[PDB]
Amino acid sequence: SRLIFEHQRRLTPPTTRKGTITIEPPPQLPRVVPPSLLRRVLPMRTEEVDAERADYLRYLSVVRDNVRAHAAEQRAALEWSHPEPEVLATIPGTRRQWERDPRDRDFLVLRAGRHDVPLDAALKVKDTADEIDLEPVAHSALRGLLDVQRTVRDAPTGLDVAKLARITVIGEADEARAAIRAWIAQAVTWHDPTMLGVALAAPDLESGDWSWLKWLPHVDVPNEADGVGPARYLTTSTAELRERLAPALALKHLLVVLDDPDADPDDIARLTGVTVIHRTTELPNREQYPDPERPILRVADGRIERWQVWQPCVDVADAMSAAEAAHIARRLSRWD
Amino acid sequence: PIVRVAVLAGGRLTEMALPSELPLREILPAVQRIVQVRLSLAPIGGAPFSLDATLDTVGVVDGDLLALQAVPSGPPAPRIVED
Amino acid sequence: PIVRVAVLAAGDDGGRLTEMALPSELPLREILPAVQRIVQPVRLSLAPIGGAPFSLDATLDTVGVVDGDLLALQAVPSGPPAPRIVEDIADAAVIFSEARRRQWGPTHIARGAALALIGLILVGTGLSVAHRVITGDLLGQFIVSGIALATVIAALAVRNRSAVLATSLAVTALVPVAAAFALGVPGDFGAPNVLLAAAGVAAWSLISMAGSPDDRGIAVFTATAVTGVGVLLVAGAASLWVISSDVIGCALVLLGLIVTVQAAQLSAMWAVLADLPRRVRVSQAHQTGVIAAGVLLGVAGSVALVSSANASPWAWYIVVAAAAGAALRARVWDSAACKAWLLGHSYLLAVALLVAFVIGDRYQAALWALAALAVLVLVWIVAALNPKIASPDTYSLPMRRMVGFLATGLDASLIPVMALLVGLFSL
């Protein structure tokens, strides 16, 4: 039926030099004496302080070059590990489909879109003086460098679903399913069937919607035939999905999406690695200072906004269509 | 022993699980009663298979898109490529 | 419901072109793996030649594919890669202004030297010819015979070294060649002086087009060769006789008409098949050259018939009929520059008539010449704004047949009108 995969080792992207870049502080605003014109009509004046300003701005150009190199390496790694959701149809044929080991620093981390990754380099000045007033053009340039270069521009972020354990999206009826489909295709493209599996609860499941999980080899269990599909975790009842999952849930990771806002959401947990996905109708208004794990996400036209007391967290969303993910799963089903 | 593919008939590619080592003389009216001159399965942009032959010898695998088309008048049209 | 195309993919070494029968009414992301498997990173897609690649959500019939079209595998054009943001305005001026090719180098100095040389030659000819015509002197022809011989031996000398300065010097060299062959046998501006000038111009153009390496210059040299032969013929006819009473203009109009209608036979007169992409280009240039003469001679006599005031109304008819004859052949010529010359013949006619009525000090039909030129630019604006009137695919077939017969009859009428205007039939 299926073909065979051989787990060749992952290629290595050019890693980010995660260090501590230090900038020397600006000079100390030296008091120029007014030139005392009797020694000015004859031809520490302004020339020495201007030459020292030019020296500091040369040094600031050098450290701006270094910071831009760090940001280029970071965006190169993030574009190697999270491609735009059209490239990953060409992935599952070549030697880079089941590539993300749990030892690599990207594992069970999913692309939601492109926004401002905060530049994991340090950018720490060694300002040690006790509020000595700085030079008004050197310190202005350093303050202009530490605020627009410390945030990388629109770069592929990560919805790390190894440490959230509940992805309860809210929003529209099918526009939330776009983002769910997008990062669930991102999940099933990069990681092995034996390293994670995927499960579904849905009322109208085999109807041109979520039926594209028909071909996913991650919906399997070991040693059960069930006619055509191996296990077919996609069902219509969440409790029947749980008893379908009860030997599988007691580490092979899991990703359980639910389509019903009602019909006992989160009746599986509350587990110890199983992370569930849910779509709810409407928001909580006064959630009690929400945890770093289990967040709230509302899908706008192109924004995936988080809940923090609106902290949009994605500037442009990644929205996969239905037949696109159908083609991803159809190319994926050949290999195992 | 069964292989679940998508089949083009006029579109709406269906999800039919075809047997591996069985003749298409029974599966062609079976797919004609599932999704819908002599018809046959073919790869997209390819020649149609032999009507008695098996799937695993001609080699289709889960995830292929097979289309239903009439068997031609004998040649395979081997696609003379000008480089 | 299948459609057969031929797909084109050139990424590895050369390119493969293959026929296939793609099933329609399917979005292209389903049949792209088939063609990608056949004729063979970044996700590819089918594309019409010269256009954006097809969006994968569309099918082959929602966007329009004909049976037999040529489709090329192009990458998805997705978008721009994160434009840079720098806030140091000095660094923002040194960084963002590097898309300038601003290196001075030993390759801009060559263009400067070539343009400086052509400027020297043109301004020396202008100075010396103005000195010769505003005074009476023999140093003007002296320095013109100096500079023209200098440009001819320079264009002949640097020929096999750069081949771009050679043809450019040879093109700009026929203005002092025209002056030096125009000033010999002095008289008072002469009737055979323009004969000698056109003979020198056509002779030098034949020398240079015989010695030119390739194209980009065969058009201008062939054009000036044919109009040099034409002005040589009419100046021989007006120099070896005494009849000049507006016999020059009608003869030049008929000569321009002859080299306009018989341009296909005349243009191929100058001419493994592997040097075909050279040859036809050369032949195409030769075509344009003769058609340029079909305007130029065709305007040069066309001014001389309406040169003085109170002239005969048959000349006034024959100049507008020559304009409509050379402007109604603007649909039979396939290329763009031939059509442009034949449409700009009327514009050149109005501008040359305006400068004629300025030189002759008339100032009353010169404003009418500006008015006719305003009519011409208004009909250009009408043909350009709403792009539906001047289109043969919207005009019916017997109507365009009647307009073609009008253009067939209109350029036969000027020949007996010339024959009666000169006095050949008034004997």
Concatenated DSSP letters of A21-54: -EEPPP-----PPP--GGGTS----HHHHHHHHH
- Smallest CA-to-CA distance from A215 within A298, A128, A92 is with A92
| Residue position matching structure tokens 């036969």 | C412
What technique solved it?
cryo-EM
Distance CA A325, CA A329 (A): 6
How far apart, in Å, are the Cα atoms of C202 and each of C2, C90, C299?
A: 61, 58, 18
Strands C2-9, C70-75: pairing kind: parallel
- Smallest CA-to-CA distance from A336 within A188, A193, A229, A214 is with A193
Beta-bridge mates of residue C7: C18, C71
Q: Are A100 and A10 in contact (CB under 8 A)?
A: yes
What letter does residue B82 receive in the DSSP assignment? B
How far apart, in Å, are the Cα atoms of C226 and each of A169, C209, C280, C316, C331?
A: 80, 12, 19, 26, 23
Kindly state whether residue B63 falls inside one of the protein's structural domains.
yes
B61 Cβ under 8 Å from any chain C Cβ = no
Beta-bridge mates of residue C27: C59
- Smallest CA-to-CA distance from C311 within C380, C248, C257, C385 is with C248
| Residue position matching structure tokens 């030099």 | A17
Resolution in A: 3.8
- Smallest CA-to-CA distance from A246 within A261, A184, A238 is with A238
Per the structure, the complete domain to which residue C13 belongs is given by 2-75
Distance CA C206, CA C170 (A): 11
Residues near C357 by Cβ (< 8 Å), separated by ≥ 6? C363, C364, C365, C366, C369
Distance CA C273, CA C281 (A): 14
Q: Are C87 and C137 in contact (CB under 8 A)?
A: no
Angle between helices C174-183 and C105-134 (to 10 degrees): 20
Distance CA B19, CA C32 (A): 27
Give, in degrees to the nearest 5, the angle at Cα A232 between B61 and A189: 60
The three-state secondary structure class of A166 is strand
| Widest Cα–Cα separation across chain A | 104
Beta-bridge mates of residue C5: C20
B11 Cβ under 8 Å from any chain C Cβ = yes
Nearest by CB: A324 against C29, C33, C82:
C29
CB A214 to CB B63 under 8 A?
no
Q: Are A138 and A56 in contact (CB under 8 A)?
A: yes
The three-state secondary structure class of B3 is strand
Distance CA A81, CA C272 (A): 54
Other C-beta atoms within 10 Å of A76: how many?
A: 14
Instruction: Name residue C302's amino acid.
Output: S
- Smallest CA-to-CA distance from A83 within A205, A7, A183 is with A183
B34 Cβ under 8 Å from any chain A Cβ = no
Phi, psi angles (nearest 5°) of residue A233: -55, -25
Residues near A69 by Cβ (< 8 Å), separated by ≥ 6? none
B3 Cβ under 8 Å from any chain A Cβ = yes
Q: Are C334 and C282 in contact (CB under 8 A)?
A: no
CB B62 to CB A1 under 8 A?
yes
Give, in degrees to the nearest 5, the angle at Cα C363 between C361 and C366: 110
CB B43 to CB C34 under 8 A?
yes
Cβ density class C374-392: b for 16+ within 10 Å, e for less:
eebeeeeeeeeeeeeeeee
- Smallest CA-to-CA distance from A168 within A321, A284, A301, A246 is with A284
- Smallest CA-to-CA distance from C233 within C199, C189, C268 is with C199
- Smallest CA-to-CA distance from C198 within C252, C119, C126 is with C252
- Smallest CA-to-CA distance from A2 within A76, A73, A92 is with A92
Distance CA C244, CA C235 (A): 10
Q: For residue C61, give both structure tokens.
A: 């019939």
How far apart, in Å, are the Cα atoms of A61 and each of A75, A121, A330, C87, C425?
A: 21, 18, 51, 11, 90
Residue A249: exposed, middle, or buried by beta-carbon count in 10 A (0-12, 13-18, 19+)?
middle
- Smallest CA-to-CA distance from C353 within C307, C385, C388 is with C307
Residues near A92 by Cβ (< 8 Å), separated by ≥ 6? A189, A328, A331, A332, A334, A335
Contacts of residues A297-302 at CB distance under 8 Å and 24 or more positions apart, as own/partner, are A297/A167, A297/A168, A297/A169, A297/A170, A297/A171, A297/A179, A298/A169, A298/A170, A298/A171, A299/A169, A299/A170, A299/A171, A299/A172, A299/A175, A299/A176, A299/A178, A299/A179, A300/A171, A301/A175, A302/A113
Helix ranges, chain A (H): 46-81, 138-148, 175-190, 238-245, 322-332
Kindly state whether residue B40 falls inside one of the protein's structural domains.
yes
Q: Are C166 and C206 in contact (CB under 8 A)?
A: no
Beta-bridge mates of residue C70: C6
Distance CA C345, CA C293 (A): 11
Instruction: Name residue C86's amino acid.
Output: V
User: Sheet harboring B39-43: ordered strands across?
Assistant: B14-19, B2-8, B65-70, B39-43
Distance CA A99, CA A96 (A): 5
Residue C6: alpha-carbon gap to chain centroid: 36
HEC string for A254-317 = EEEEECCCCCCCCCCCCCCCEEEEEEECCCCCCCCCCCCCCCEEEECCCCEEECCCCCCCCCEE
Q: Are B62 and B4 in contact (CB under 8 A)?
A: yes
| Residue position matching structure tokens 């004969």 | C195
Residues near A188 by Cβ (< 8 Å), separated by ≥ 6? A196, A198, A216, A218, A328, A329, A332
B26 vs chain C: nearest CA distance in angstroms? 24
Other C-beta atoms within 10 Å of C164: how many?
A: 15
CB B61 to CB A334 under 8 A?
yes
Instruction: Name residue C100's amino acid.
Output: R
Q: Are A119 and A152 in contact (CB under 8 A)?
A: yes
Q: Are C302 and C349 in contact (CB under 8 A)?
A: yes
Distance CA A214, CA B13 (A): 14
Distance CA A290, CA A313 (A): 15
Query: What is the sign, positive or negative, of the torsion defined by CA atoms of C287, C289, C293, C295?
Result: positive
Q: Are C17 and B81 in contact (CB under 8 A)?
A: yes
Q: Are A159 and A112 in contact (CB under 8 A)?
A: yes
C4 vs chain B: nearest CA distance in angstroms? 9
Residues near C347 by Cβ (< 8 Å), separated by ≥ 6? C373, C376, C377
Q: For residue C142, give both structure tokens.
A: 């002296």
Nearest by CB: A334 against B1, B15, B63:
B63
HEC string for chain C = CEEEEEEEECCCCCCEEEEEEEECCCEHHHHHHHHHHHCCCCCEEEEECCCCCCCCCCECCCCCCCCCCEEEEEECCCCCCCCCCCCCHHHHHHHCCCCCCCCCHHHHHHHHHHHHHHHHHHHHHHHHHHHHHHCCCCHHHHHHHHHHHHHHHHHHHCCCCCCCHHHHHHHHCHHHHHHHHHHCCCCCCCCHHHHHHHHHHHHHHHHHHHCCCCCCCHHHHHHHHHHHHHHHHHHHHHHCCCCCCCHHHHHHHHHHHHHHHCHHHHHCCCCCCCCHHHHHHHHHHHHHHHHHHHHHHHHHHHHHCCCCCCCCHHHHHHHHHHHHHHHCCCCCCCCHHHHHHHHHHHHHHHHHHHHHHHHCCCCCCHHHHHHHHHHHHHHHHHHHHCCCCCCCCCCCHHHHHHHHHHHHHHCCCHHHHHHHHCCCCCC
Residue A115: exposed, middle, or buried by beta-carbon count in 10 A (0-12, 13-18, 19+)?
buried
Which residues of chain A have a CB within 8 Å of the CB of B1? Answer: 1
Distance CA A46, CA A43 (A): 15
Q: If you measure CA to CA, which chain C residue comes closest to B67? A: C23
Distance CA A304, CA C205 (A): 72
Give, in degrees to the nearest 5, the angle at Cα A186 between A184 and A188: 70
HEC string for C328-359 = CCCCCCCCHHHHHHHHHHHHHHHHHHHHHHHH
Other C-beta atoms within 10 Å of C223: how many?
A: 23
Residue A15: alpha-carbon gap to chain centroid: 17
Beta-bridge mates of residue C22: C3
What letter does residue A222 receive in the DSSP assignment? S
CB A64 to CB C88 under 8 A?
yes
Which residues of chain C have a CB within 8 Å of the CB of B79? Answer: 18-20, 38
Length of chain A measured in residues = 336
Q: If you measure CA to CA, which chain B residue comes closest to C3? A: B45
Which residues of chain B have a CB within 8 Å of the CB of A213? Answer: none
Interface test with chain C among A151, A327, A334, by most C beta carbons within 10 Å: A327
Domain total in chain B:
1
Q: Are C118 and C169 in contact (CB under 8 A)?
A: yes
- Smallest CA-to-CA distance from A255 within A319, A159, A157, A161 is with A161
A281 vs chain C: nearest CA distance in angstroms? 29
Instruction: Name residue C367's amino acid.
Output: L
Instruction: Name residue C137's amino acid.
Output: D
Distance CA C402, CA C413 (A): 17
- Smallest CA-to-CA distance from B3 within A206, C108, A126, B15 is with B15
Residue A230: exposed, middle, or buried by beta-carbon count in 10 A (0-12, 13-18, 19+)?
middle
Residue C221: alpha-carbon gap to chain centroid: 12
Q: If you measure CA to CA, which chain C residue comes closest to A54? A: C90
CB B63 to CB A215 under 8 A?
yes
Count of CA atoms in the C-beta half-sphere (13 A) of C332: 18
- Smallest CA-to-CA distance from A327 within A210, A212, A190, A187 is with A212
Q: Are C174 and C205 in contact (CB under 8 A)?
A: yes
Angle between helices C397-410 and C313-327 (to 10 degrees): 140
Ramachandran area for residue C12 (φ above 0: left; ψ -120 to 50: alpha; else beta): alpha
Query: What is the sign, positive or negative, of the torsion defined by CA atoms of A270, A305, A256, A251?
Result: negative
Distance CA C367, CA C373 (A): 10
Strands C70-75, C44-48: pairing kind: antiparallel
Kindly state whether residue B81 falls inside one of the protein's structural domains.
no
